[PDB]
Symmetry: C2
Subunit: 221 residues, 2 copies
């Protein structure tokens, strides 16, 4: 009669759950097979001088997210790498990803290696959301005047609006800088780096994957 | 020239890496297809239980109705099963993207019961690219449309058509049932955008059929 529709729908629900597990396993297999190839690519790209600076400076999508003054320091990036921790952990979300930016030896920004981790959280309304943890970054020396962290420690607990005009201008400039993106979490809206999740996806899925193409375009007529 | 030769060497390494990476991605996708096809077989067995599931999915979808003549929809009421099979699983036939679509017609007075399986293959274009082609498959048309069947009219004038027969040829080439005669190597003279309809039936409507069904049965 009509209970057959209900039984078929229950079978479909169980099938959809099993299908989700199967697709997850297949995607994790692909990530595990593809991560070592990108490790090899990282090793090769470290040979090419100023590769990532050229890729980033040519890109307009990237230039929207950063201030023009920041670009000068991005010249001293030796490596951008994306690692999917599902290869090792195999216990969380398979789309979680970590972006590592390494700055080499230069007089303008101290040499360092910054690894920022991003996780996927399912919002109550169905969709996927990117969140992150703040990672400490050694800012360029010339930009220490606009570091929001220094100004925020100077105005500890004092009113959000009772800052000096100079300090407010520098705080806004520093929140517009690329280097405050490392303090982006996604759970303090209006108070963090603007559109941090979009920049994360840009660095992990378009520039990183197609970096060779953007480089070749940047060195062609 | 200190860095020119090393840049060229790095680019050669990157090219070798790109070739190996393409091979790896092909292997991973073949694994995904092999692991996912049996699940879609189980889903086909379950969906054959649900009455007029595919009619609801096809009729509610606006993307699908654009590719066909509206009158064809009347007959799509009597579709009980649509299936997609990727032959890379068993034989490594050709390109791993080859796929076969099977449409089954249930019990109805208007079009004879049948099962039509149309096979699509991928051809590597001379400039590196891929192209979709297929082989013509004979189909038992609904009775009412035999007057406009392009094969019937083409055989009548096997020698410049009459106005009625030319108009019916135009009407039938726009019909859904001439899509089974699509090959992809006769441009301007075949069914329009057959590859797009094939991809829509194989990768959007078929994969997400449950979602479109529930949407079709909601306010
Ligand atoms: Cl990936
Ligand atoms: Cl990925
Ligand atoms: Na139409
Ligand atoms: Na899907
Ligand atoms: Na509706």
């Amino acid at each position: 009669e009509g209970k057959r529709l209900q039984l078929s729908l229950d079978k479909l629900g169980d099938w959809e759950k099993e299908m989700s597990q199967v697709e997850r396993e297949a995607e994790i297999y692909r990530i595990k097979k593809t991560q070592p190839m990108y490790a090899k690519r990282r090793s090769i790209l470290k040979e090419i001088p100023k590769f990532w600076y050229i890729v980033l400076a040519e890109n307009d999508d990237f230039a929207d997210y950063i201030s023009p003054d920041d670009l000068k320091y991005l010249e001293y990036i030796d490596d951008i790498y994306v690692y999917y921790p599902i290869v090792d952990d195999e216990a969380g979300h398979f789309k979680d990803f970590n972006i590592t930016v390494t700055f080499g030896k230069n007089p303008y920004i101290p040499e360092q290696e910054i690894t920022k981790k991003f996780k996927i959280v399912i919002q109550e309304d169905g969709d996927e959301r990117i969140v992150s943890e703040s990672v400490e970054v050694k800012w360029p020396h010339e930009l220490s005047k606009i570091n929001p962290s220094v100004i925020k420690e100077k105005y500890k607990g004092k009113d959000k609006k009772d800052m000096s005009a100079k300090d407010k201008k520098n705080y806004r400039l520093g929140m517009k800088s690329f280097f405050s993106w490392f303090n982006w979490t996604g759970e303090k809206p209006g108070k963090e780096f603007r559109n941090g999740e979009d920049l994360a996806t840009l660095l992990s899925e378009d520039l990183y994957l197609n970096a060779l193409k953007y480089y070749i375009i940047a060195l062609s007529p």
